[model samples]
Target: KVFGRCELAAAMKRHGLDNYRGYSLGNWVCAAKFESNFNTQATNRNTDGSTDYGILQINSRWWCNDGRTPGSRNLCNIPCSALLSSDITASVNCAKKIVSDGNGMNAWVAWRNRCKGTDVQAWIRGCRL
Candidate 1:
């Protein structure tokens, strides 16, 4: 379940996810494997039996407002797959939006740190605008 073995090169390229050459994609894949087993339809549940779904582990019912529906988990409505299907534009944009909500790319950065051997704070500081 490694991401840097060049097996996912096609998926990465198809998703325009090649900008991160050293190990970012690999790191993401590692995190994905740990979290969701790389299943696009993965979901999680709370103690109350509520579920969070999809690859990014987004709470199924709480995502996507600018596309089709505002409160539904329609895969067509949210387009998490389509969003994650890329790395540059939509994927980065989606991550940025989520980061604005306080998470701030910590998960991704952690993945990069562990899998890619990158310095998280230094990487983020480089992203300062």
Candidate 2:
């Protein structure tokens, strides 16, 4: 599930995610680097009993469902496992919806805590997009 930063940037750019809806691609890449290190199979269980899925760590509480978790809103309309695949179309699409709803990259705690007001060029430093 490893990914090259430049490869990811090109894909996101193709999806028009760089500066999409006013959110910077650098922030997105930075957050994903920390959240899952670009591992599509990453999944983490929160103390609140919700699971975070995929590279962006989309939460099950409001975005997806693993069937075992009850009261999941599944707002992304995608199965939690869907985001765990190597193909990131669903993951990126869901992330886009999250950004749109939450006003920029505020939906990603990593972006807020680590990427906000920080030097983000390294996230895309050598990416030949």
Candidate 3:
């Protein structure tokens, strides 16, 4: 949890809250909680040959080859490289844009409550504005 928080904080600083579009750091944290229980090193089984890896539980197939800036070649070539590279931030920022653009932070807020079994609107509690 500590490591995840540290990396997330740093990644937030690197990306900036304004860079988040409609998604704030609180929303990012909320999404993290929903995705991997906030575990930075988390990985999951994939039906594909590759693994789903890291804080965002990014699938190697998608993240490793997705057409995006700072393309996933590194994530594709290096074993578990996505775990350490800026790809993690890329994943979050990409998700932030998608979620924020289509659904707003409320999507993350709702996901937190629904997926994590939290009280409604808990995503914003204790969030540092």
Q: Top TM-score: which candidate number? A: 2
Q: 15-85 in candidate 1: lDDT tens per residue? A: 64434433354444454544455555455664543344444444434443323334454432445444334
Please give each candidate's TM-score. Answer: 0.44, 0.94, 0.51
Q: Name the better of 2 and 3 by lDDT.
A: 2
Predicted structure 3, TM vs. truth: 0.51
Report the C-alpha displacement of residue 48, candidate 2, in angstroms: 1.3
Cα lDDT of model 3 by residue, 48-118, tens digit: 46565555555555345433323234333334544535446655544554454455554444354654444
Which window of ten consecutive residues has the lowest lDDT sum in model 2? 7-16
Q: By summed lDDT, which 10 consecutive residues of candidate 1 come out lowest?
A: 120-129
Question: How much is the lDDT of residue 49 in candidate 2?
Answer: 88
**Model 2 lDDT vs. the true structure?**
0.86
List runs of model 2 lying over 4 Å from the truth. Answer: none
How big is the positional error of residue 107 in model 1, measured in Å on the Cα after superposition? 4.1
How high is the lDDT of residue 79 in model 3?
48
lDDT of 1: 0.42
